[model samples]
Target: DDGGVVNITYMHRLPDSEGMTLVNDIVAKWNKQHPDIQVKATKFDGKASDMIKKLETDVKSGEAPDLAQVGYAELPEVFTKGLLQDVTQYAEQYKNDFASGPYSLVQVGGKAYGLPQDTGPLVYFYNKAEFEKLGITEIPQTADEFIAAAKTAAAAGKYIMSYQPDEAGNMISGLAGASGGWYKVKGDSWVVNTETDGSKATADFYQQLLDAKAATTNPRWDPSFDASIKDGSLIGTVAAAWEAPLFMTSSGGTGSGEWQVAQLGDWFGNAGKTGPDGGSAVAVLKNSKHPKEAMEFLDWFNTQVPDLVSQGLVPAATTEDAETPSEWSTFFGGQDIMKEFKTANNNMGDFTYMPGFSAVAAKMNETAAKATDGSGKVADIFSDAQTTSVDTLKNFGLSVS
Candidate 1:
């Protein structure tokens, strides 16, 4: 009321829920806290992938939002398209506040594009009830131990874990990340290495488990997976920290006490080591006339680490990632879930994604499906994935070898 206001169009795709309301409350607080700038928050029509497409379309027509949630993987594409403005000048001041792994995802060519929000360090979400019934006491720390447990579960007519063809690329990325970043950008040439010591080892192990029928091959987010989890047929599987909330809400919200967390099986013989499955950052677009103001909002939102954690986002900040809030989650029967994620995040490999992951991911799904159906060799998955990605990247005018 005492000053002029600059309207900022903020687009996101959070479905209405306590989480969405919390976001709106923060926006309202921001508008009140800074009278000079007001945000016009709008809900986008779809998920992150859909929103990314929309953002790309809008940007092509010069209608992108001032700020939007962009995935770490999508940054390379967005950056190559010149859709984001470098905010390193503002971001550098608080750069050390973020974990090195999370921070690296938003940096390109030694410039920062956005502030890290949530990180998705991978972990195992398992059913404690099933483990007890199977006579499993300690959580496995190595691949042999994990596979042994899976075999036992399989023999007892149980599924300790499952695989999804649709998410095979991400699964590989996470496993590779546990050992090293499989994708690397080498100054004008991108190197997609699915045969890295860590990545190849992980793929071969997963293939073995699949071939032995120790794991079920079911598509993710599909009815089969849903039915499996709800009926107790699925004991557990690998997941990112961010999937915590969804596990609680789905399955009729009744798995609260039965669910538990465990470290990722050490594929590299390094116990508790893990990798990033998913995460996002907020970026200021080059189209923004009030870049500084948007940065102000981002800085507030990103650094309000406690509030973000309370809203169910896995904190990317080292200091806060492990901190248990005053009221710990009843979702996991009062387990210190954040503490588990912290342990994984602490050991997570610092990884990077290529600009052409979309094609690689799509092709990975197709190949994994074929392999799951006995038409292809599982060991050949990543090498084929690399080939598919390299071809796509080159077609997109990116120099890759």
Candidate 2:
């Protein structure tokens, strides 16, 4: 027990219910088993975007921690700013442990930068009993079918979903990604094209819903949106498979056992390709004086932390021990929603990345808000965000198409 203790700071935004408890429990185990390595976990104040800003400020003041949790998208932004340490060697260490899709999330320019912690493959969730009441007995299998169902929902004085204007950028990303939209960095240039068949399909689909008045408009996760669910105005949502718990929590006793999960219906040519949603990874910082020790801590936590699959977040790791809790399925009449989600995860489209996404998202939200409230064409949100995205990249002195 006389091994010299090496203390390191680890930062993250996970709350008490969303994997923090697992992390704390695992850290306690690690501290007892390896007395020489002690990690002090720091709870950050916000989402990945907010966490990114805080880390940037800390790095500027030369007080950056040894490690932090970052979204898959945020990693590229932070890496470009020279705030991260390369931990690509772990790619070989855990090659047999993680699935290729999540593994790809942490890789940049053919090099691994971090350990993927959580992945959010998009899926469909709705009130099944309500759908049956509207005579929409079959889950839609195509984009046109989904649109037809929305029209039926509108006639019944209900909405198939809520269009979250404030989350416009993320909404577009998932929708477009499902249709094979991709963004990449090549040499000194940024590829900022969201105008693919996927994008056009998304635009047409959302625009048709808005024109038909078949969807509600509100900020996602807000009380108003929750009220819409409880009161039965918003009957469904397309979200990351990981969002099941939050939906269950908000629906409360109102829609108990009424909600259900289903496949993300097909796109024009996507052939059932699903988009990714909120996922996270753990990374060491360039500021760490003990980079090797910091990485050692991460390698252990990500690879060996027990019950990571059964208790909290779904495992990005490919090991067979990862079990989806039956409790999550119990809420949906024991239908095994996690099993469906895992299936959806496998059909995801190609990976994409963009620098300055925070700015791009903010601009998209502004553009969508204006379109929602003005006489502006709602489909213009994509065009506007794409234009602003190009401008933002060019401002950062990167060439773009």
Candidate 3:
């Protein structure tokens, strides 16, 4: 192993054309700048769960990459399995480079395990033209107002949003984050609070919309949902900032100027709070032989905001003078959508995912499907998720309260 101190291996799942280009360019630049500590980047083309399983096997065999791209929600699972290195000693210095919400995701119990890369803070996207035609002059400011708007849209045979049973777990997690979080560590036990006042309020809000047939129950990414989006039957959605490009592509560009974004409003009076739907970090693996060099590369890589933004990413780096991509502005009718995204990012509340969250999410989707089929209530999914979360954590040998 010829004095193994210089070479570092990075495994990432950036499979998109733009992401691949950016990753290669950055790695090349870094390699050119630091000849001594060269990095070998390999793209992993597999589902996140599969990648994690592979990583677990590799770590045990002492073949884990020096750094790996892990989703923010998956961090807890990886960390609890003893697969992540404690980078707090090196990473804490860059804390101020990221927003508190994103920064918090890479930290577990006050210890940093990874460097934040990109974040997707939840924001409200609405079809302005459709809203105007429906006689709605303003976005809803509260849950009650949202329901009122939903009912009005229903009267016109339109939906203010869709009830996504397929994405119930993910959507609930984001909403719960805005509702002051659902999971937390208390002493030696993990606490599950899916029945919090704010959470129940959020559940009830959507349930009422369902009861009134105000929101459509179309599964996301399905042909039916795509048709609904293209036909403008679905007028608005609460989604991550990264969804802008996807929304454009989903509508086949016909909705270029019709869609506008706003900061997700009060969740039944929980004002000025949002939650993360998607985000990722470059975490140093516990099996890395070059932990220091790995962190060094990550620190430099994450701060290249302009380069990252060019790939249509919402960079986690919070530089004050970062430029908003012109494409985003043009797509949203020159409304400066990044300004709205920045507001939502700043409003993101604290949330934590317990280990074995995948099992909990799977359980949610299983139970939520019944709601879509007219056999269950959407509100019940929260309590079911709570029960499943507790059971899953306990099954994983984690103490639960």
* TM-score per candidate, chains pooled: 0.90, 0.91, 0.90
lDDT-superior candidate, 2 or 3:
3
Provide backbone clash counts, one per model.
Answer: 0, 0, 0
* C-alpha RMSD values across all candidates: 2.8, 2.6, 2.7
**Residues 1-401 of candidate 3: C-alpha lDDT, one tens digit per residue:** 43634999989875445322358777899999888789888878665446777888999999889999888888999898999999898887788888776788898878988898887788888889889998899987878888998999999988987777777777766776676878888999988987777667777777788888888888776788878888878888877787766666677665677778888778443567888776789999997877777888888888888777655568888765456677667768778777787778777776678888777777776777787656787767778888988998998898998
lDDT of 2 by residue, 124-163 (tens): 8888888889998888877788889999999888888677
- Score each candidate by Cα lDDT: 0.74, 0.73, 0.79
**Model 1 lDDT, full chain set:** 0.74
Q: Quick one: ranking by TM-score, best first?
A: 2, 1, 3
What would the C-alpha RMSD of candidate 1 be, to one decimal place? 2.8
Off by over 4 Å in 3: 1-5, 14-21, 48-50, 61-63, 155-157, 267-269
In TM-score terms, candidate 3 sits at: 0.90
lDDT of 1 by residue, 318-365 (tens): 555445443346656567888887777777776677776767767776
